[PDB]
Amino acid sequence: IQRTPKIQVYSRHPAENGKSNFLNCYVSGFHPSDIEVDLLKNGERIEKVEHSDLSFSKDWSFYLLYYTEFTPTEKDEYACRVNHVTLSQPKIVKWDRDM
Amino acid sequence: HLSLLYHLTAVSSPAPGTPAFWVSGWLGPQQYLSYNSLRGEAEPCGAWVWENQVSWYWEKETTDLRIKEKLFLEAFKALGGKGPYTLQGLLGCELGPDNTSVPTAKFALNGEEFMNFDLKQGTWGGDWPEALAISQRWQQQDKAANKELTFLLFSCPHRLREHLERGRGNLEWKEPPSMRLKARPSSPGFSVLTCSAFSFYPPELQLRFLRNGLAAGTGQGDFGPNSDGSFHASSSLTVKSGDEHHYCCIVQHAGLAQPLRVELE
């Protein structure tokens, strides 16, 4: 069976302009396990991105955390871009600083 | 009480540079173990790197998981055909109310639960022909059932008790969430209020909205991990534009002594 990913984007700590932080893209609920994820800064792919181990939940769906160290500013926009076999095109989820 | 659970996955055609087989081990909601078939060594995670263990602890975890690696890869040969296949296992134990071990041994094929291990008979089984095929292949392998029995009935509870003793402080960790409540405009006449909880542990957390001190619902939200195994959560409520200041959020979490009221920024 195939399951399409849920995507969440949030910082590790409350965002404060000029304070170092981490940006997370948490992708979960998907099957099969092959997935492609990029963090974007004003549309540009971020190079220094790490990710947790591919693991899975009680319902057997897979999940994965991508994260990158960053310093938010007032004007810079961040997003997460995800490709998976269930998706007809890559899904882009913008970082909402409130979330 | 707390569970030790191994999450095992094999894939029949791994992408290049990725493992055909990998494992994560969990003590309740935090990961203590990693293993993959490319490195071939079981390793500690996070604070468990600094745990004081018995001299042979990690080599024995490695020994057991190399055995499961071979079994999972044997499973694909029992199915035959082009695939691709994903085989997952959830193996572990938890201590029960009377201080005995309760085993877990379930498997899924291509995302669907399809097989278990029966500890009373020492046999794998399931209804699908894929279950019968894999179970028979595993059942015919010398000492495979015996090693599965030992793993679940003896090794797992022994490991769980050792980690409860040597890492009790890691498991009792209580980090209270940093809270924020913020509104943003939405469709005309409406705003979206978001209560957000940052970097907390353990994952159990409640967020509730109040309107003029009266219950206004849980809102809709989500939760997820941070890179260090702490967690993050948010919940959001649609409210009428101009009414946002009547709302607050309440959070309950074990790192706090009382429910905490969070006011709008």
Author numbering:
A (entry chain B): 1 to 99
B (entry chain A): 4 to 268
Task: Quote the study on this structure.
FcRn facilitates new-born humoral immunity by regulating Immunoglobulin (IgG) transport across the epithelium. In addition, it has been shown to bind to IgG and Human Serum Albumin (HSA) at nonoverlapping sites in a pH-dependent manner. Existing as a heterodimer composed of β2-microglobulin (β2m) and a membrane-anchored α-chain, FcRn is homologous to the class I major histocompatibility complex (MHC1).
Two copies of FcRnECD were found in the asymmetric unit. The FcRnECD crystallized with two copies of the heterodimer present in the asymmetric unit, packing in an anti-parallel fashion. In particular, SiteMap identified a ligandable site at the interface between the α-chain and β2m. Additionally, motifs within the HSA binding site were also conserved. One of them has previously been identified as being critical for albumin binding and was the site of a protein contact in our pH 3 and pH 8.5 crystal structures, between the two copies of FcRnECD in the asymmetric unit.
